[PDB]
Amino acid sequence: NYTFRCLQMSSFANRSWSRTDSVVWLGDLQTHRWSNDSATISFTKPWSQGKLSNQQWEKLQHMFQVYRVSFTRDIQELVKMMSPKEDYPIEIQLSAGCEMYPGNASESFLHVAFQGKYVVRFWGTSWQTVPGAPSWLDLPIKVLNADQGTSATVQMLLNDTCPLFVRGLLEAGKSDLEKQEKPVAWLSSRQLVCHVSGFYPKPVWVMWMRGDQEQQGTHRGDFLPNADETWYLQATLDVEAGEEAGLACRVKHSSLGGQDIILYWGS
Amino acid sequence: IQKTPQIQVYSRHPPENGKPNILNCYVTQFHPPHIEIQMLKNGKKIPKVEMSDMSFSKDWSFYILAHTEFTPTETDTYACRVKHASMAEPKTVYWDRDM
Ligand SMILES: *[C@@H]1O[C@H](CO[C@@H]2O[C@@H](C)[C@@H](O)[C@@H](O)[C@@H]2O)[C@@H](O[C@@H]2O[C@H](CO)[C@@H](O[C@@H]3O[C@H](CO[C@H]4O[C@H](CO)[C@@H](O)[C@H](O)[C@@H]4O)[C@@H](O)[C@H](O[C@H]4O[C@H](CO)[C@@H](O)[C@H](O)[C@@H]4O)[C@@H]3O)[C@H](O)[C@H]2NC(C)=O)[C@H](O)[C@H]1NC(C)=O
Ligand SMILES: *[C@@H]1O[C@H](CO)[C@@H](O[C@@H]2O[C@H](CO)[C@@H](O[C@@H]3O[C@H](CO)[C@@H](O)[C@H](O[C@H]4O[C@H](CO)[C@@H](O)[C@H](O)[C@@H]4O[C@H]4O[C@H](CO)[C@@H](O)[C@H](O)[C@@H]4O)[C@@H]3O)[C@H](O)[C@H]2NC(C)=O)[C@H](O)[C@H]1NC(C)=O
Ligand SMILES: CCCCCCCCCCCCCCCC(=O)O
Ligand SMILES: *[C@@H]1O[C@H](CO)[C@@H](O)[C@H](O)[C@H]1NC(C)=O
Predict the structure, then answer these.
(1) Among residues A178, A206, A231, which one ends one of the domains?
(2) A37 is in an annotated binding site
(3) Cα-Cα-Cα-Cα dihedral of A214, A215, A220, A221, to 10°?
(4) Contact B8 A228 (CB under 8 A)
(5) What is the CATH number of the domain that holds B35?
(6) CATH code of the domain covering residue A106
């Protein structure tokens, strides 16, 4: 499965100041950025254009350019019309894209959050408020649904453009998407810590062992990203001291073959 | 409403004294997205810190990763200090010399 997610983050401080920035991910790898200070969408991979031609890419980019200006104008107009009921500052986030599944399968999404809370989605052929969203959103959403052109374009982008573009990405990015990077491990410390860093892809197994027996008390921490598209994880084990002798951290990962890393506490 | 940042500091390679390495400061779970992040060496601001693009998670909270070249030694401390509207005072988390 890979999920392609286009993330837009827009901040409005007052009638005079706002910015919109986006980042696009395929799985856990960034493919684009679009900074507010930039006229055009930046590639963060050599394959970020997927299989689109320079001219399709340009048309697609020009639509987004138009959308980003329209979006900004429409939200500021919306705040004026509601004044003084919707107060600055305002934070709007959108998460849009598709999840590619086994075979030909894909599902798209478009969710919108306001002040950090999900309020609206596009589903089927229209925009909807999600239950629990503030009731002042109903009217502007009813209005936006009367805009047939936007509805068709959003339907096309979600139902058609997204999956097709992403199949081109997985083709074009294949060698980065399937890359394998090997973890290095080290031990520190009462509480024993096994630190494992530099692995890719994300799936990994890390355990405190005594001989053949997995120590059940092993606690896996969170996966933390490194800055070079690899992952960091630690696993910790609480142990009565003296008692440290005979424990080892074991790491199993696809990049290693069946050559696990085994680190024994005590050297 | 506001969410206070969580801060974790950890090194890219095993930290060995005198060996150049990369120290990471990952700041998560915050809202709104405006934030200020410094990495400190003995309490002083480190100049060349690189930041990722800000992004957000499934639960909508924001996150960003900062990282810098560093050499662990027997006598230097390192830390990550964050300023955010959700806190009255800048919050600082020291690297624990192991992570
Ligand atoms: C794009 O795909 C849309 C489906 O995909 C979902 O949403 C998108 C945006 C992505 O997130 C994707 O991953 C999702 O899976 C598709 O939306 C579908 O559009 C058709 C109309 O073109 C809808 O048909 C109408 O349905 C209603 C019934 O709606 C209710 O009941 C059904 C289940 O029984 C639910 O699923 C709905 O959610 C509602 O609860 C009918 O009343 C209606 O019939 C009337 O109109 C037709 C003429 O079109 C006449 O022939 C009939 O006799 C009636 O007069 C329609 O059948 C369908 O509900 C809708 N799906 C959803 C989930 O809303 C969209 O059309 C695609 N667009 C393009 C351009 O490809
Ligand atoms: C995110 O990106 C968007 C879109 O690019 C930014 O929105 C645009 O911001 C620009 C730059 O601020 C802005 O251009 C202004 O239009 C004003 C009228 O509405 C002009 O009056 C103003 O001109 C002054 O500043 C210019 C340099 O920026 C000078 O070259 C010019 O000579 C003018 O200088 C006079 O007036 C200014 C006051 O504006 C004054 O300080 C000077 O001393 C002198 O009196 C700008 O051209 C666009 O209107 C915006 N475009 C949009 C909304 O589509 C947005 O700001 C970005 N957000 C952030 C935070 O970066
Ligand atoms: C709104 C539907 C988006 C999904 C369509 C898939 C086409 C890929 C676009 C890739 C670059 C887009 C950059 C995001 C711009 C933005 O959100 O403001
Ligand atoms: C709008 O907010 C910006 C960003 O905080 C701030 O610098 C400025 O005071 C405001 N602009 C005006 C004209 O008030």
Answers:
(1) A178
(2) no
(3) -150
(4) no
(5) 2.60.40.10
(6) 3.30.500.10
